[PDB]
């Protein structure tokens, strides 16, 4: 019902779930803007990233589809409680923020690349995005404030 | 005569000076390609910028002429030693690289807009640009590596 949400059916299980077309998040439960938000992220870069390099690898060669598989694995592990978002960011994020558990600090509109901004402002506090595609790569976003 | 450097005559002084038509650097003293360079910048946006918005201001309304006056003013404070480049970038850059004292990190050709890229690769390590004009606004570039 709320802006951007779709009620859908898994094509494998028939299970009802909810998908947000601004954050790309999905959740089983039916769902129910701030001047500034604070977000942490986990970035997985790919060969078409604007800067296909990070602390992890001088030259990033994984495809966009490989980056998306990695992101989807992190999301599964976070949603299941098997892993912490911020600990996965610290270990695997292709970002200089990985060291700060993926914290990018507070921002208003006008600072972040538009897809990351749109997802960040549409999250609830404590909520995680789905895969968010930017010029930089693929992100998961955790709104912290 | 390193790349883009040329000799000129000061009308008012009578003395030879040096100007770089790629970096817009100018200096009395005679001066003197890697895969990657590391540069810091100070960006001043204007109402005609590709994205008239930054972490400093939702709506950037200053004119291109006013943006250039601010840039010339900052270059003056830097060269006089009244302000470090880092202190002015931290306070007044319209790029959120202000958080990292203007540091954009290491990049290769292909990532940055051509006038910024060309200036960045034409600077030697430690050197600073004059006003560099992009679609994003007006930059002072400092090559750090
Ligand atoms: N220790 C430590 C430490 C070190 C570094 C950080 C860190 C903190 C903040 C950032 N960051 C980067 C950005 C800007 C940005 N970038 C982005 O818009 C996005 C992004 C892409 C890639 C990496 C990080 C952010 C969101 C999409 C970017 O590409 N912006 C463009 C200019 C145009 O108008 C959109 N803002 N903040 C980057 C790094 C934090 C902690
Ligand atoms: N803490 C922290 C922190 C916060 C932010 C950053 C930060 C890091 C990197 C960037 N950045 C922006 C860009 C895009 C680039 N952009 C550009 O080419 C230019 C640019 C404009 C505006 C801002 C920054 C760069 C040089 C002209 C651009 O516009 N490129 C175009 C695509 C076409 O092929 C040329 N790449 N990296 C922006 C911000 C780093 C650290």
UniProtKB/Swiss-Prot annotation, chains A, B:
Organism: Homo sapiens (Human)
Enzyme Commission number, as recorded: 5.2.1.8
Pfam families given in the database record: Rotamase, WW
Effect annotated for changing residue 17 to A: Reduced affinity for KIF20B
Coiled-coil zones: none
Keyword annotations: Acetylation, Cell cycle, Cytoplasm, Isomerase, Nucleus, Phosphoprotein, Rotamase
Recorded catalytic activity of this chain's protein: [protein]-peptidylproline (omega=180) = [protein]-peptidylproline (omega=0)
Protein name: Peptidyl-prolyl cis-trans isomerase NIMA-interacting 1
SMART domains: WW
Matches recorded under InterPro entries: PPIase_dom_sf, PPIase_Pin1, PPIase_PpiC, PPIase_PpiC_CS, WW_dom, WW_dom_sf
Protein's GO biological process: cellular response to hypoxia; negative regulation of amyloid-beta formation; negative regulation of cell motility; negative regulation of ERK1 and ERK2 cascade; negative regulation of protein binding; negative regulation of protein catabolic process; negative regulation of SMAD protein signal transduction; negative regulation of transforming growth factor beta receptor signaling pathway
Domain remark text: The WW domain is required for the interaction with STIL and KIF20B.
UniProt-annotated location(s): Nucleus; Nucleus speckle; Cytoplasm
Subunit structure: Interacts with STIL. Interacts with KIF20B. Interacts with NEK6. Interacts (via WW domain) with PRKX. Interacts with BTK. Interacts (via PpiC domain) with DAPK1. Interacts with the phosphorylated form of RAF1. Interacts (via WW domain) with ATCAY; upon NGF stimulation. Interacts with PML (isoform PML-4). Interacts with BCL6. Interacts with FBXW7, disrupting FBXW7 dimerization and promoting FBXW7 autoubiquitination and degradation. Directly interacts with RBBP8/CtIP; this interaction depends upon RBBP8 phosphorylation.
Top EC category: isomerase
GO molecular function: beta-catenin binding; cis-trans isomerase activity; cytoskeletal motor activity; GTPase activating protein binding; mitogen-activated protein kinase kinase binding; peptidyl-prolyl cis-trans isomerase activity; phosphoprotein binding; phosphoserine residue binding
Tissue spec. comment: Expressed in immune cells in the lung (at protein level). The phosphorylated form at Ser-53 is expressed in normal breast tissue cells but not in breast cancer cells.
Presence of the UniProt keyword Nucleus in the record: yes
Chain ranges of the WW domain: 1-32
Phosphoserine modified-residue sites: 53, 90
Effect of residue 28 to A: Loss of binding to phosphorylated target proteins, including to phosphorylated RBBP8/CtIP; decrease in DNA repair of double-strand breaks by homologous recombination less efficient than that observed with wild-type protein
Role played: Peptidyl-prolyl cis/trans isomerase (PPIase) that binds to and isomerizes specific phosphorylated Ser/Thr-Pro (pSer/Thr-Pro) motifs. By inducing conformational changes in a subset of phosphorylated proteins, acts as a molecular switch in multiple cellular processes. Displays a preference for acidic residues located N-terminally to the proline bond to be isomerized. Regulates mitosis presumably by interacting with NIMA and attenuating its mitosis-promoting activity. Down-regulates kinase activity of BTK.
Main location: nucleus
UniProt modification remark: Phosphorylation at Ser-53 by DAPK1 results in inhibition of its catalytic activity, nuclear localization, and its ability to induce centrosome amplification, chromosome instability and cell transformation. Ser-53 is dephosphorylated upon IL33-stimulation of dendritic cells.
Keyword Electron transport recorded: no
Start and end residues of each PpiC domain: 34-145
